[PDB]
Amino acid sequence: GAMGPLPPGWEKRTDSNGRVYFVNHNTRITQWEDPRS
């Protein structure tokens, strides 16, 4: 994670679709963004 992708212990990946996506699985969360706060 770090000051980069998957900040809050997140499963993020950057495929050449070349976009940054975020898969956070608490209940049901799916968005392509750093969740910072």
Joined together, the tokens standing for residue 26 give: 């608490």
Distances (CA, A) of 6 to 16, 19, 30: 17, 13, 12
Which amino acid, 37? S
Amino acid found at 36: R
The CATH number of domain 1-37, selected from 3.40.50.920, 3.40.50.1950, 2.20.70.10, 3.40.50.720: 2.20.70.10
Which residues does 13 contact at the CB level (< 8 Å), separation at least 6? Answer: 5, 21
The Cα 35–Cα 20 span in angstroms is 12
Question: Taking Cα atoms as reference points, which of 13, 10, 15, 16 lies closest to residue 29?
Answer: 10
Neighbours of 22 (CB within 10 A): 19
Bridge partners for 22 per DSSP: 12, 31
Residues 14, 20: contact at Cβ < 8 Å? yes
Strand partners, 23: 11, 30
